[PDB]
Amino acid sequence: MRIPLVGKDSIESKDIGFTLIHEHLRVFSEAVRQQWPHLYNEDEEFRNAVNEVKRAMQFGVKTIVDPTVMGLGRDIRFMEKVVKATGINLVAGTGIYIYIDLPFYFLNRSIDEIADLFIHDIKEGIQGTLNKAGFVKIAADEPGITKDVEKVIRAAAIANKETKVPIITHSNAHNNTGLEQQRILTEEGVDPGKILIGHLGDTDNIDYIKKIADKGSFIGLDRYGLDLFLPVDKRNETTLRLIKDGYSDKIMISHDYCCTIDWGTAKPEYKPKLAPRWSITLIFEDTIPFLKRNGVNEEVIATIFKENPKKFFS
């Protein structure tokens, strides 16, 4: 069969249903959580993940793709507990989340032994369990394409050609990282249709977004609610204009919501100023309503949240 699910039997990609392609049940810094655990409360972290999933499903969400990996505190056992209490289709991934340099472990190690880490997760299981990864997550940001970042990228390029699984990327919309991720992965033999260049919905600079979509890769309008990168309105006018231009087949929409996140910028007291209406159901309360009283039919909605996720994992 097609797609691995956490705590469940793998599914035919055709049975994915309404999908949020980019959502985090919980993120934290492994290093920080290992050394200072007094800072965390996994009971509040569970109550939060459950409730945010329990809802969403009430809105008809069938599948959630969670791109929490190394650097973000992936926890297959925690994810597995959420599933028990909600019964959601959850897809976990492999990969490394860095902006500048890889952890020391990787000093003098090759691109391949990084790839073998991803491949291990996709074929054997993740973290001692038999739950396999469904995708590879890689990142790049303000610092640009460093030598270490380029390694994690080329490692993914190998994991894809090996396990066929798709590649999700985190990028900076204002600096070209997204185009570089696509540009490198493609030149390594990866099918553009298997790459989701992420966080492209942070810029209202459409000409750019289009070139990434014109080069065959899915465009991620995936941080709805985080006004600090770009407010809801300018995101909605950006999607819309793209759909109207006939790009609804590359468009993939999500929140990037973290039911719990230890990043300081995310202190439950910068919320009102940085990301006021940010949750895992904001597209149902704003985006979808907005897009339908604006000349976009249920068939296009189905293309974005159903057909596109399916194509991505097929």
Ligand X SMILES: CCOP(=S)(OCC)Oc1ccc([S@@](C)=O)cc1
Binding-site annotation: residue ranges for Fe cation: 22, 24, 137, 256
Q: Which region among 29-37, 56-64, 180-188, 296-304 touches its own copies (by CB under 8 A)? A: 29-37
In the complex, what is the shortest distance from the CB of residue 36 to Fe ion, in angstroms, rounded to a whole number? 20
Contact status: 266 vs ligand X (CB under 6 A): yes
In the complex, what is the shortest distance from the CB of residue 265 to ligand X, in angstroms, rounded to a whole number? 4
Binding residues for Co(2+): 137, 170, 199
Nearer residue to ligand X within complex by CB, 18 or 224: 224
Contact status: 272 vs its own copies (CB under 8 A): no
* Interacting partner of 265 out of Fe ion, ligand X, Co ion, none (Cβ under 5 to 8 A depending on kind): ligand X
Nearer residue to its own copies within complex by CB, 162 or 286: 162
**Spatial separation of the C-alpha atoms in residues 312 and 133, rounded to whole Å:** 15
Contact status: 34 vs its own copies (CB under 8 A): yes
Neighbours of 182 (CB within 10 A): 25
Among 263, 276, 289, 302, the residue binding ligand X under the rule CB under 6 A is 263
Handedness of CA 198, 201, 202, 203 (dihedral sign): positive
Contact status: 75 vs Fe ion (CB under 5 A): no
**Spatial separation of the C-alpha atoms in residues 285 and 202, rounded to whole Å:** 20
The DSSP string of the chain is: --EEETTEEEE-GGG--SEESS-BS-B--HHHHHH-GGG--HHHHHHHHHHHHHHHHTTT--EEEE---BTTT--HHHHHHHHHHH--EEEE-EEE--SS---GGGTT--HHHHHHHHHHHHHT-STTSSPPP--EEEE--TT-S-HHHHHHHHHHHHHHHHH---EEEE--TTTTHHHHHHHHHHHTT--GGGEEE--GGG---HHHHHHHHHTTPEEEE--TT-TTTS-HHHHHHHHHHHHHTT-TTTEEE----BSSB--GGG-TTTHHHH-TT-STTHIIIIIHHHHHTTT--HHHHHIIIIIHHHHHT-
Contact status: 268 vs its own copies (CB under 8 A): no
Among 96, 256, 280, 305, the residue binding Fe ion under the rule CB under 5 A is 256
Contact status: 228 vs ligand X (CB under 6 A): yes
Among 10, 29, 48, 176, the residue binding its own copies under the rule CB under 8 A is 29
Contact status: 24 vs ligand X (CB under 6 A): yes
Max Cα distance, the chain (Å): 56
Nearer residue to Fe ion within complex by CB, 148 or 256: 256
Binding residues: 22, 24, 137, 170, 199, 256
Nearer residue to Fe ion within complex by CB, 4 or 67: 67
Nearer residue to Fe ion within complex by CB, 139 or 155: 139
**Binding pattern for the stretch 87-106 against its own copies, x by CB under 8 A and - elsewhere:** ------------xxx-xxxx
* Interacting partner of 50 out of its own copies, ligand X, Co ion, none (Cβ under 5 to 8 A depending on kind): none
**Spatial separation of the C-alpha atoms in residues 136 and 10, rounded to whole Å:** 17
Residues engaged in binding ligand X (CB under 6 A): 24, 27, 72, 107, 226, 228, 256, 258, 261, 263, 265-266, 270, 274-275
Residues engaged in binding its own copies (CB under 8 A): 28-32, 34-38, 69-74, 99-101, 103-109, 117, 120-121, 124, 126-128, 262-265, 267, 270
